[PDB]
UniProtKB/Swiss-Prot annotation, chains A, B:
It is an enzyme of class 4 (lyase). The keyword Nucleus does not apply. It catalyses: methylglyoxal + H2O = (R)-lactate + H(+). Disruption phenotype: Results in higher sensitivity to oxidative stress, reduced thermotolerance, accumulation of higher levels of reactive oxygen species, and reduced chronological life span. This is Glutathione-independent glyoxalase HSP31. SUPFAM superfamilies: Class I glutamine amidotransferase-like. GO terms for cellular component: cytoplasm; cytoplasmic stress granule; P-body. Keywords: Cytoplasm, Lyase, Oxidation, Stress response. Its main location: cytoplasm. No protease activity could be detected. Belongs to the peptidase C56 family. HSP31-like subfamily.
């Protein structure tokens, strides 16, 4: 029986940082989970609201993209790039095909995930079928409006999750940008929908939580752990 | 409400392992937190049910005790040993003198912490006064019967915590000992008192949780992080 994962990417790719650089998909938040899932025999399909995406430019720097990751990223024939080329649109997705819905991130997600009704519907179905819903970094932004079809209440209500920290936004100086663009942080989303937010000791720590079949991670350093937890949570 | 920490130690020190070795206080679970609190300007008082304790023999191994830790451990004039020498009994303790109650562990805690009514009352008072209650490894055994003065309900009810894993007991082959000795695991205690147990990816990982002013860690590798968390939590 083919084990499949639907890996969502932000469809937002535009100027964001004060240096004029664009945000979008944080490379390793898509690549590490991809590698982790593939390693365990899972098939992975990518998807975005528009079927298109762009890379967060800061995630392209050597500090965040190097070694084997950089090699796979540059190799047009890598399993990673070939699968990205087949990225789907929500309409082209058959929710019942997946056991795991994983929301990769980058700040771009703050723009499209909250309003991604179709992806939320898919995630909701996958969860309703007993599958796992995972999100890393700003990925939990998609929990804004994500309803549990069984209870009809927010999927994260009464759940414990983690995700990008408010303090991280402040340290990066993007806090003023989020406010100016009327964007809500992960902690804002958690508070709004009655979820219990549990923070990492430090904003850049590899930190993740598994609450039943709801798995969350804090940042790029947590992408691998988040993917690992999503696989383990299949027994929940 | 002075700047002091009450560091609880298990008073149990008897043969426990299959190799005939005894359990007791896991050295680094007392030392690492001790160092962290002292570094941040806190005064530390040690305490145990009987005012006496013994070291877990397996925690004396080089893999668990080495470097500076091993030096401070062997130096009779070390601030650590000098403070350990002044270890108190619950009756000699004044709960209003502490901001943080920290329960160090080692398997021995499974024998005395659940019944340590006097230590639980102290922990309850410290928490009621707005202080922090923390526990690492098997330390959460201290939560068995621990009541929240504000509501009369179990202090951990409705709270998210972590602690030593059931799988870790199995891997160590000590599960048969707990069964024979009618002991409850940390996960058993969380389940019994309505807490949500959040597990680490691996049983030996440095993993900890801060849920308001209730702080928990999984194992020896998590002792430092648990102490760090208890300090940062004083603002929650």
């Amino acid at each position: 029986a083919p084990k499949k994962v639907l890996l969502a990417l932000t469809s937002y790719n535009d100027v964001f940082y004060s240096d004029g650089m664009k945000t979008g998909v944080f490379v390793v938040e898509a690549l590490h989970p991809f590698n982790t899932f593939r390693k365990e025999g899972f098939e992975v399909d990518f998807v975005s609201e528009t079927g298109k995406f762009g890379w967060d430019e800061h995630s392209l720097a050597k500090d965040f993209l190097n070694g084997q990751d950089e090699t796979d990223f540059k190799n047009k024939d890598s399993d990673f790039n070939k699968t990205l080329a087949k990225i789907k649109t929500p309409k082209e997705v058959n929710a019942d095909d997946y056991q795991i819905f994983m929301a990769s991130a980058g700040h771009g997600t703050l723009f499209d995930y909250p309003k991604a009704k179709d992806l939320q519907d898919i995630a909701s179905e996958i969860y309703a079928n007993g599958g796992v819903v995972a999100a890393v970094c700003h990925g939990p932004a998609m929990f804004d409006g994500l309803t549990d079809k069984k209870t009809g209440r927010p999927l994260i209500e009464g759940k414990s999750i983690t995700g990008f920290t408010d303090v991280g936004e402040t340290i990066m100086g993007v806090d003023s940008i989020l406010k100016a663009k009327n964007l809500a942080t992960v902690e804002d989303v958690a508070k709004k929908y009655g979820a219990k937010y549990l923070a990492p000791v430090g904003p850049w720590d590899d930190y993740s939580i598994t609450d039943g079949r709801l798995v969350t991670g804090v940042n790029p350093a947590s992408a691998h752990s988040t993917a690992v937890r999503s696989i383990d949570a299949l027994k929940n």
